[PDB]
């Protein structure tokens, strides 16, 4: 349990005060870790690239390669990938692309109208 | 100093080496008046009770017995030497002289480790042992 990377305070507090209150009622990511190395993240890129090349359809892959690279890197990469594989029926690539890529009103509307 | 017995003839030395089969024989060759000879006498005097099982320590004076002077080439105020089954033992300390011993050891534990390692390597007939501590900054 002393592996140091796991500890976060929120889950420990809401995990704790509920056990406290239960006992009373019965009585009645870390900032510390180094950022991912380009070559590991590159391994991720190759695997996910194989998985998106596995299915051109099945948007689940596109959304997955979008959100995982998002948590990893994001910025341009994800926002380009999503727009790439978004080329139509499935609404989810649009619900995701809208959320991430927008940052400004006009372009929000441009993505919304395409989904419509 | 009073704790350790002294050897007053060459035959007490030789028989002390011969009559003891199962544990190392450790002799300090030196004289009572010397500065370096009393220090290793105190160090070895504290260690004797711990080690009595696998080694025994004796004392020899050069003026009392001058017979071994030429044979083992005794110089410097003191030389500690290690004997197992009449066989002179040998260990490379880094001092460049794998024979005998010269300098004053500092800590009890470091000398007990020398005794222990020389003993353990001596049970296997191994002539040369390698100390865990190369002190050669001393010699």
């Amino acid at each position: 349990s002393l592996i140091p990377g796991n500890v976060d305070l929120n889950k420990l507090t809401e995990e704790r005060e509920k056990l406290l209150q239960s006992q009373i009622d019965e009585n009645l990511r870390v900032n510390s870790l180094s950022d991912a190395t380009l070559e590991d993240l590159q391994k991720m890129r190759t695997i996910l690239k194989s998985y998106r090349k596995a299915d051109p359809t099945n948007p689940q892959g596109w959304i997955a390669s979008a959100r995982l690279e998002e948590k990893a890197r994001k910025f341009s990469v994800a926002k380009k990938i999503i727009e790439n594989g978004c080329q139509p029926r499935s609404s989810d690539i649009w619900l995701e692309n809208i959320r991430l890529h927008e940052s400004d009103v006009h372009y929000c509307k441009t993505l919304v109208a395409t989904a419509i | 100093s009073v704790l350790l017995p002294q050897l007053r003839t060459g035959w007490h030395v030789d028989q002390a080496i011969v009559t003891e089969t199962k544990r190392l024989v450790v002799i300090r060759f030196g004289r009572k008046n010397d500065r370096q000879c009393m220090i290793m006498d105190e160090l070895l005097s504290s260690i004797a009770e711990r080690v009595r099982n696998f080694a025994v320590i004796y004392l020899c004076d050069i003026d009392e017995v001058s017979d071994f002077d030429e044979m083992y080439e005794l110089t410097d105020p003191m030389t500690v030497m290690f004997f197992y089954h009449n066989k002179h033992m040998m260990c490379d300390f880094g001092t460049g002289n794998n024979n005998k011993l010269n300098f004053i050891v500092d800590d009890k534990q470091e000398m007990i480790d020398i005794l222990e390692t020389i003993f353990r390597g001596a049970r296997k007939n191994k002539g040369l042992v390698v100390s865990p501590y190369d002190y050669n900054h001393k010699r």
Partner: protein, 685 residues
């Protein structure tokens, strides 16, 4: 480093061997500002720039927060993804998940200053909590700049024994840390001397790794000493590397290598007597000390001719232009000289030409004729060459042969392992422990577990007809996952229509199965969620992890045992459910019928192993063991028919009989001679 330190141009020289030849690289001939080792003074920003960036950063954050709420919106990361590391409180600290409970932590800057008196550790950072302040420096670039300053990974590996380890590429390799190695030795009861004796091992690995640089004529000067039975020279005492080189060559290994390659070139030429018109090939007698003696050497293999040969100018293997009109002479010889090289000269060319000329011109040496071939090999850098007198059909032979000779020989293969035990460098693919025969008994602990086998996902049936050939029809597959305890099945039935419009149908299978396992595990509450998911195919290890990142508590294992779940489609009720399904579906089963009421789950699973293993083999004739008595009725509920206990006790023997007879019959092995652990090993896999 804080200091001025330059890499001299002699350190950067690095060579690489390819099947075409040996290429060299030196950057020193370029004359410019000499390459320096970087220092921190570049990589730490001044306080001024950090505070002066802090005011403007917090200003920008305030403005952006006002613009977000001004739009009735919350801050998007992409806005602040421009500046994270900038500003002293470190804006990243605003997005930490634990911040909500850090606000109640007050007075910490004082607590750290007072940790001096509660405990004995020097705390070189008493002025920062990486929780409150954040990470105030990144030295990551110092590393890449150090790697490039030294010339790259390659120019570094020329300074090591890496090429001796025999690895082709360094990608999949890892080190066994000596820190932890020192911990596992201190759980035994040991004397203080036994204790200090184990702290010199990591130094000893380090001295091996850098040995080709640490041992060279320029570093220690001194006088050469020769390790007794080897060709290794020690310039300094170097007490550790002496010991380690002695433990690398054991039981006259240097001689076994020379004798080995000689045997090899022998057995390559001896069969070629015909093609090259050779009357005889005779490997000569060996003065047993010849391999490791340096000054003088004598020919090993001798070669004769049907008439005579056409020699050429003495040259090297990989050279092209050849002229055989130079001479016509009779018979040939070969030396094979092993060399253990320093970083000074690792080049085998110059060594082979210098030794060739010296020996051929030496009076003390002994050679059958003045026509011969020297073949040198560096065992540290795994290199080779020949400076020969050449004839038609040698270089295209000797090259192709030496290619195999360096990568084959058990001698070299023994070097490479004796070395990489000393370096404790390893290869790995899967870090997780496999299921073994000895590991089997852990399956039945209290951890909830699952078995997932994809061998049935995409299937094709070939039928025999009279006229054309091979009637083939795609069929509904199934993902077969069971937990062994509750005996409960999850089958995702994969319909044929799912395969209609795609190509490269192989990888789609493994990824679809990964997805279906993710959906299946997410369907289960955290009460029912497994811990170890166990998969037969190794190719399913990567595609599961991708989908399982959301569940870090669940662990995934492969198996060395082949589990008999591919035969699960031989059960009639199951296969009927699979053939009639018109849609992808999910159907629950209990394979154990009711076996758990009368009998524990362990023996219920281990009888299932028998039932299925025999269905892999004789199939329907293993079914005639089951269906013998029609008075024994399979209900609509169950799969297997209802028996009493003893009826099963006999049936299990009959089922074991098919396994033990067909294993031997196929492999020509007698049943009776088998040891008990060999029978259980045959049943498991």
């Amino acid at each position: 480093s804080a200091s001025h330190i330059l890499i001299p141009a002699s350190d950067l020289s690095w060579s690489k061997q390819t099947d075409t030849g040996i290429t060299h690289f030196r950057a020193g001939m370029t004359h410019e500002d000499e390459k320096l080792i970087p220092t921190i003074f570049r990589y730490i920003t001044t306080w001024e720039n950090e505070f002066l960036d802090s005011q403007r950063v917090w200003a920008e954050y305030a403005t952006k927060r006002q613009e977000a709420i001004q739009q009735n919106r919350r801050l998007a990361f992409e806005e602040l993804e421009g500046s994270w590391d900038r500003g002293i409180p470190r804006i990243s600290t605003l997005f930490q998940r634990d911040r909500h409970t850090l606000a109640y932590d007050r007075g910490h800057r004082i607590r750290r200053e007072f940790k001096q008196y509660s405990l004995e550790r020097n705390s070189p950072f008493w002025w920062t909590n990486s929780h409150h302040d954040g990470k105030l420096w990144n030295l990551n670039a110092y590393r890449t700049d150090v790697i490039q300053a030294l010339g790259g990974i390659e120019t570094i590996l020329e300074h090591t024994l890496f090429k001796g380890t025999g690895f082709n590429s360094w990608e999949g390799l890892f080190w066994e840390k000596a820190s932890g190695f020192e911990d596992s030795m201190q759980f035994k009861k040991l004397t203080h001397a036994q204790r200090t004796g184990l702290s010199q091992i990591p130094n000893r690995r380090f001295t091996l790794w850098w040995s080709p640089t640490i041992n060279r004529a320029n570093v220690y000067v001194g006088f050469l000493v020769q390790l007794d039975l080897t060709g290794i020279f020690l310039h300094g005492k170097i007490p550790t590397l002496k010991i380690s080189l002695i433990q690398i060559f054991r039981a006259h290994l240097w001689q076994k290598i020379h004798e080995s390659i000689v045997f090899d070139i022998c057995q390559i030429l001896d069969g070629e007597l015909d093609v090259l018109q050779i009357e005889s090939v005779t490997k000569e007698t060996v003065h047993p000390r010849k391999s490791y003696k340096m000054n003088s050497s004598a020919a090993d293999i001798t070669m004769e001719s049907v008439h005579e040969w056409e020699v050429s100018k003495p040259s090297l293997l990989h050279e092209t232009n050849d002229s055989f009109k130079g001479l016509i002479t009779n018979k040939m010889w070969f030396d094979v000289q092993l060399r253990y090289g320093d970083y000074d000269s690792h080049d085998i060319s110059r060594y082979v030409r210098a030794k060739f000329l010296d020996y051929t011109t030496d009076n003390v040496s002994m050679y059958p004729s003045p026509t011969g071939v020297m073949i040198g090999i560096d065992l540290a850098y795994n290199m080779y060459d020949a400076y020969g007198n050449w004839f038609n059909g040698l270089k295209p032979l000797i090259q192709n042969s030496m290619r195999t000779i360096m990568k084959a020989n058990p001698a070299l293969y023994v070097l490479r392992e004796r070395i990489r035990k000393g370096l404790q460098i390893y290869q790995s693919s899967v870090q997780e422990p496999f299921l073994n025969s000895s590991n089997y008994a852990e399956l039945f602990n209290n951890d909830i577990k699952l078995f997932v086998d994809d061998t049935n996902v995409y299937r094709v049936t070939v039928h025999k007809t009279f006229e054309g050939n091979v009637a083939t029809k795609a069929i509904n597959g199934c993902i077969f996952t069971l937990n062994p305890k509750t005996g409960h099945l999850f089958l995702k039935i994969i319909h044929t229509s799912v395969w209609a419009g795609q190509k490269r149908l192989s990888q789609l299978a493994k990824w679809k199965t990964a997805e279906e396992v993710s959906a299946l595990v997410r369907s289960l509450p955290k009460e029912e969620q497994p811990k170890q998911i166990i998969v037969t195919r190794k190719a399913m290890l990567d595609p599961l992890e991708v989908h399982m990142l959301d569940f870090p508590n669940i662990a995934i294992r492969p198996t060395e045992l082949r589990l008999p779940f591919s035969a699960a489609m031989s059960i009639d009720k199951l296969s009927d459910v699979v053939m009639k399904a018109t849609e992808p579906q999910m159907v629950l089963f209990n394979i154990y019928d009711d076996w758990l009421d009368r009998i524990s789950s362990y023996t219920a699973f281990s009888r299932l192993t028998l039932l299925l293993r025999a269905l892999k083999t004789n199939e329907e004739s293993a079914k005639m063991i089951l269906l013998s008595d029609p008075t024994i009725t399979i209900k609509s509920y169950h799969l297997w028919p209802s028996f009493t206990d003893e009826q099963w006790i006999t049936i299990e023997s009959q089922m074991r009989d098919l396994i033990l007879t067909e294993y031997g019959r196929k492999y020509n092995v007698n049943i009776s001679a088998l040891t008990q652990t060999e029978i259980k090993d045959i049943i498991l896999g």
